């Protein structure tokens with residue numbers, strides 16, 4: 001029902017970024033067929049059809065190749081050489097379908113000294129300077145969950161690659177291979193810090209920068225109730241609006257960007273915010289441009305008016321799940337279909353006419 | 355040169371997610387024309403043509419509309435209502451070009467109680483449970499830079515939106531509006547934690563989970579020299595390789611997933627890692643599946659063999675910048691063109707034939 005209605009996707013069951021890129025294609029209307037090893041409660045596996053095949057057997061190889069022959073996109077997320085050894089490498093796939101967008105999701109990439117090494121999100125962002133930049137300066141770096149490598153710089157770059165190559169396909173009539181390494185994607189994800197490094201606007205020192213928690217106007221504060229607000233008041237008119245709401249006289253404060261007095265500045269904002277609870281500050285800074293919001297825990301998210309009003313989440317046995325993103329005015333995505341029982345691979349083949 | 359060679363993009367000069375989405379389109383071959391208010395050192399503005407226009411004047415509005423008439427994609431990142439009041443809203447653009455992908459990059463979205471409020475990355479991820487999930491449990495949440503809202507759940511979803519709509523356009527012959535809200539994108543980026551919350555595999559407690567730094571096998575460790583390694587050894591066989599490298603007898607340790615004894619497990623791993631420098635562990639683990647990697651600071655990234663060999667970065671003027679991601683086997687992206695002087699808008703219009 002969304003913009004990708006009609007798009008045929010073969011996903012080889014993996015973990016992390018592959019199934020997340022595959023979910024997003026399904027979210028937006030694609031026909032995604034997932035092949036697993038010979039009814040799921042993982043909501044990530046929404047908007048698929050699940051089939052099963054031993055890719056190491058002659059029948060399973062044959063069936064999967066017949067499935068790939070009728071597809072637009074193949075997603076795989078194993079080590080380089082794995083699909084090759086199975087007989088499902090790009091050159092074998094090309095033989096039965098040269099319109100195929102062959103999408104390879106890895107952390108290290110297809111080649112290079114580490115391309116055969118095991119790893120996960122934390123490893124990939126450790127090697128490109130990202131992880132070192134995250135957390136408080138007086139402590140060892142903290143992982144930003146797996147948002148940066150696996151998803152932000154992983155699956156999202158796989159999708160761009162995939163859709164980019166489909167655009168190319170319109171003029172050339174041919175697919176190709178998408179080499180999507182989390183180490184690359186995440187670097188492009190963080191290109192802003194690389195730009196700013198070159199002009200003296202970002203330093204290698206952890207938690208001493210504008211957007212890393214070093215700036216008293218770009219950080220969380222703890223309130224009277226042990227809960228938190230986020231302050232994001234970069235621009236001076238926003239910062240001023242923020243001080244107005246706190247009832248602080250600007251003339252009694254250090255300048256916003258005098259870094260030499262940032263501890264003094266923070267101590268004064270800390271005292272201010274500590275004086276009431278989080279919900280007080282949401283009432284105080286209601287419609288304002290102060291860039292002050294409540295830090296909601298996952299469980300409170302569904303009670304937030306802006307979240308509710310725009311239907312950012314829907315309920316699915318177990319709890320809340322995010323609606324497809326982004327939104328489309330003419331071809332709107334549907335609410336995601338729940339994970340369902342495994343179906344017969346043959347049924348899909350007839351459906352796809354193969 | 356890359357997959358998106360031929361694609362025409364008009365970017366209305368903004369900040370954060372908009373310019374980054376437009377950068378990535380340029381990286382991949384797109385013809386990107388950026389309109390600013392009446393030669394840049396910001397490497398984010400690579401792969402552009404820069405022109406200038408007062409959109410509030412008759413002349414400037416006319417010229418911009420002539421430019422938009424000839425484009426495939428318009429990127430704007432202002433408050434909802436701004437383009438409208440300029441005469442550049444979707445319904446005006448539709449008049450001159452109904453094939454236009456009109457891409458609206460916001461934090462709050464186009465509608466809702468907060469849609470007119472100022473904000474930055476920290477605010478958008480604060481309202482959807484993400485920011486609360488980030489940092490050590492004994493401390494107030496820390497911002498994961500602006501990686502998750504602006505970029506991972508912002509620009510990246512704008513891109514997917516844009517390219518998805520271009521796919522739709524091939525059958526329908528029409529464009530539409532992409533509503534890309536960082537509050538939506540970032541939720542879908544974190545869909546995994548929402549899936550796991552539903553099945554008891556994720557909790558709302560900060561720093562007490564498998565991927566947030568609560569797991570001793572999924573965290574950084576400080577070494578003898580004050581530098582760090584990242585451990586990512588989730589799977590038992592990797593965890594085992596990790597222990598072998600450390601010279602640790604598994605029989606003398608608590609089980610890997612005995613959470614009750616995670617403090618005791620971490621104290622033993624801490625003592626082990628602290629005994630040598632980062633690069634010793636660099637060496638001992640450089641080759642195995644132990645999921646142990648050095649935590650590199652931005653400045654030392656360009657010296658890492660895997661980074662060097664795959665050309666993840668190029669030097670621009672001054673320092674290193676990331677190469678286009680992902681990679682394409684047939685239509686490879688070029689090295690990005692540096693920011694250049696502003697060019698006259700007329701010249702572009704003749705080029706585009708408008």
Ligand SMILES: CC(=O)SCCNC(=O)CCNC(=O)[C@H](O)C(C)(C)COP(=O)(O)OP(=O)(O)OC[C@H]1O[C@@H](n2cnc3c(N)ncnc32)[C@H](O)[C@@H]1OP(=O)(O)O
Nearest residue numbers: 015016036037053054055056078079106107118119120121
């Ligand atoms: C959410 C997260 O935390 S994930 C973080 C991101 N990690 C990644 O996915 C990065 C890229 N991938 C990898 O590095 C690796 O695949 C790892 C580390 C995840 C896993 O490593 P391993 O499981 O040891 O190796 P790998 O996944 O490459 O091999 C999978 C095997 O299953 C086989 N296999 C897969 N599907 C099937 C099937 N349907 N039938 C039969 N065999 C199958 C493959 O042929 C392969 O066997 P082989 O090793 O004999 O060739």
Ligand SMILES: CC(=O)SCCNC(=O)CCNC(=O)[C@H](O)C(C)(C)COP(=O)(O)OP(=O)(O)OC[C@H]1O[C@@H](n2cnc3c(N)ncnc32)[C@H](O)[C@@H]1OP(=O)(O)O
Nearest residue numbers: 370390391407408409410431432433436461472473474475
């Ligand atoms: C790097 C970072 O961390 S940034 C974080 C990214 N997130 C965001 O900021 C969200 C993005 N969207 C927004 O909410 C907003 O654009 C903000 C809050 C960033 C900034 O808002 P403001 O600076 O107050 O301006 P706003 O976007 O409302 O409007 C732009 C103004 O410039 C004017 N303008 C824009 N282009 C032109 C032009 N070429 N010629 C003349 N005027 C122009 C518009 O008329 C408008 O003025 P108006 O409000 O009088 O109509």
